[PDB]
Symmetry: D2
């Protein structure tokens, strides 16, 4: 449900995700991270399943942030892959990969993995 | 300057990734997977570092495909996160997460992880 | 602390982890999964940092279960990588990789990733 | 039978993995990393499927190294999870998780993920 996803969300670190779900499956918005080499808002773009299953399955989605805006550039990008689970206590449960640009010799330690849970604030 | 990310790329499974890199960091294009519950092309969108470091570092990037088009809907989405390494034989090295829409009970087994290497050959 | 790790632990799915931490850095024990193609106990072996930092850092550890015992064989193995965080509310926070044996053509979808949090029961 | 997992293997970074596979599923040996905060050999222990499927499937396995030995202590541990594929050119294909001991504040950045391919060359 585009309107189910569309809104302001926060995760367990205190980061803010503002997203709009388009009817063609597009996600666009901004992300503000509470941690890491980041300041202010960053552009995000992603995609979601705009026709999910009618049962109690979640809606699969994903989005990317490259950590460069007009104030800072961390030379890194994170992708979040997860699912939206609707209802009263709407949640988006994700796992993420954060890759930093590195020299070829340091490429083995270029990528962090983690997981974030997002809670929606009253839309 | 010199981000030769724009083009048609192929990974080791034979999937085709056609991307345009915008001057301000946007990635847009289409993806056609040679494997999985997929047929024909799917829309992708992503982001990349449009001013990378001047030392020998790769360019960080990432993108998403939701596997729904006019033919099929797999109820899943993949994100690739990696770096572009330019040069005479340019490559995009990625790790990816493929999440399927599941019930809560099956959420523990909702996400596959793998790694794809893209070259222009 | 070997004695800090040693004990019975349960995660959010209802699975049971019984572990003994050896003074040489060895972990041995048994694992019972509440989900998946598993029944009864399975042998686990792992390693941990037996001399962690004296600050508030966690103790890094990891262990493996191959899902074959005398009752069932799922032809898969999981490795958990994480850290033990001591105290009153002792926790082990992990991420895991579950690989299934597959044919070469299905090898792209061989591995699941997830995360489990373990709580210790009164030792 | 035929699990030719036992031996000395090398990955793409030039690290050396010396393993013995026990008849009942145990893996034991040593690991020497060519990269990272590591020197000399470290103890590894793991598990593998000692009765794999009879179709063309690989053998699932996994092992752990805690990066402490008599020389150094990195306060970290790596787990590799993968499958052994036998044949004329046998390979072990893995994905790994490297967790460092961190404070709670830094737990979000405690875990690296990568992938190693081992061959006997
Ligand atoms: O340090 C960087 O390279 C950029 C900031 C990264 C912030 C990460 S993205 C995953 C995790 N979730 C968050 O909300 N913030 C951190
Ligand atoms: O089966 C699905 O759910 C949709 C197709 C998934 C194809 C995956 S995405 C990661 C990997 N890289 C590819 O080029 N194809 C597979
Ligand atoms: O289905 C299988 O192949 C074997 C059982 C797998 C159980 C997994 S391991 C990770 C997760 N944590 C658990 O406690 N159980 C599941
Ligand atoms: O730096 C550390 O914390 C200890 C050494 C880590 C070496 C890693 S483990 C994964 C990868 N594969 C290797 O052979 N070496 C690196």
């Amino acid at each position: 449900a585009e309107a189910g996803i569309t809104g302001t969300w926060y995760n367990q670190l205190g980061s803010t995700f503002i997203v709009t779900a388009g009817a063609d499956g597009a996600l666009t918005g901004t992300y503000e991270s509470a941690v890491g080499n980041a300041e202010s808002r960053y552009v995000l773009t992603g995609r979601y399943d705009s026709a999910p299953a009618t049962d109690g399955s979640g809606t699969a989605l994903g989005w990317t942030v490259a950590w460069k805006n007009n104030y800072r550039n961390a030379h890194s990008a994170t992708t979040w892959s997860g699912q939206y689970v609707g209802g009263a206590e709407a949640r988006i449960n994700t796992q993420w990969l954060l890759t930093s640009g590195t020299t070829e010799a340091n490429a083995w330690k270029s990528t962090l993995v983690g997981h974030d849970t997002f809670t929606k604030v009253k839309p």
